[PDB]
From Swiss-Prot, chain B:
This is Decoration protein. Cooperatively binds the expanded capsid, thereby stabilizing the mature capsid shell and allowing the large viral DNA to be packaged. Trimers of capsid decoration proteins molecules are located at local and icosahedral threefold axes and stabilize the expanded capsid, which shows increased spacing between capsomers. GO terms for cellular component: viral capsid, decoration. Homotrimer. Interacts with the major capsid protein. It comes from Thermus virus P23-45. Keywords: Capsid decoration protein, Capsid protein, Virion.
Curated annotation (Swiss-Prot), chain C:
The chain holds residues 1 to 52 of 409 of the full protein. It is found in: Virion; Host cytoplasm. Assembles to form an icosahedric capsid shell with a T=7 symmetry although with a diameter of about 82 nm, which is a larger volume than the usual T=7 capsids. A dramatic reconfiguration of the capsid shell that expands the procaspid from a diameter of 66 nm to a supersized capsid of 82 nm, allows packaging of the large viral DNA genome. The capsid decoration protein binds the expanded capsid and stabilizes it. The lineage of its organism: Viruses, Duplodnaviria, Heunggongvirae, Uroviricota, Caudoviricetes. Homomultimer. Interacts with the portal protein. Interacts with the decoration protein. Belongs to the lambda phage major capsid protein family. This is Major capsid protein.
Amino acid sequence: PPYYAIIAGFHGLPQLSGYNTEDFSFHRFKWLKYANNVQSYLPPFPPKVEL
Amino acid sequence: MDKVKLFQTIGRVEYWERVPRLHAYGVFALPFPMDPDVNWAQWFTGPHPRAFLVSIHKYGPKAGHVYPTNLTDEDALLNVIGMVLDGHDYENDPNVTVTLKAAVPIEYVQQDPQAPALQPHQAVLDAAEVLKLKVIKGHYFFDYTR
Amino acid sequence: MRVPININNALARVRDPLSIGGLKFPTTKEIQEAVAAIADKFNQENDLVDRF
Amino acid sequence: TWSPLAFKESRVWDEKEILYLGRLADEVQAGVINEQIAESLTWLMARMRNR
């Protein structure tokens, strides 16, 4: 019974480049919670078309 | 409301993919007569993809005719021979292509026609040893030839 | 994936040639038609995390 | 020490999907599965970019 197949993929992982050398900490990006409620300062969005 | 009627949905057609099997494991299929007593048009209703375990009559007047396996009768449980992956039209063919050795997910094995699709049927898992389906992952494994 | 229909024939084939029961005879009418496929542009991909 | 990962998935097209798959509102000879394989190929490429 004739069939047909396709396989696909890769190898990898994201590497952090910089590290501190005196202590071994990392500081390049950080997050923050600045606004408690700010959805009121935003226009509404149209809904999804479930056809 | 009276002289002008607005838009209104008439039709709705949805279309799915097929039931995926493993490439690495293999396929083996042998075509069988369909048992005319069971209502086959119920088993091929919905557009969702499914697959269902099939047991063969060992003997009797309909020896060779295959029917969907009932999970209540042990003489229908022991003689299971395979599972129809794709789907079929009994209004044009009494001879379905039963697959004997394949590897189908748990999501796409529905032994009842009114059981909800895309959801694992539980009575197949609670009869996994009698039906000789080994579960190792999501994907089932069965070789009824050996 | 798409539902593999032919676009310029589905609208021509949806209607029925029975069409008797309104006035008990076939009325006249004029029909124009249109097709527009829809998909939300708000499910955007992330274009920042490959600049990092 | 760093170490990468591995990623694969696959497709199968059966014999009665390849052999006959027609248009729904048209009657053409069976050659439609080529576009279906093209869409699944592009979808697996997008799936790797999603990872």
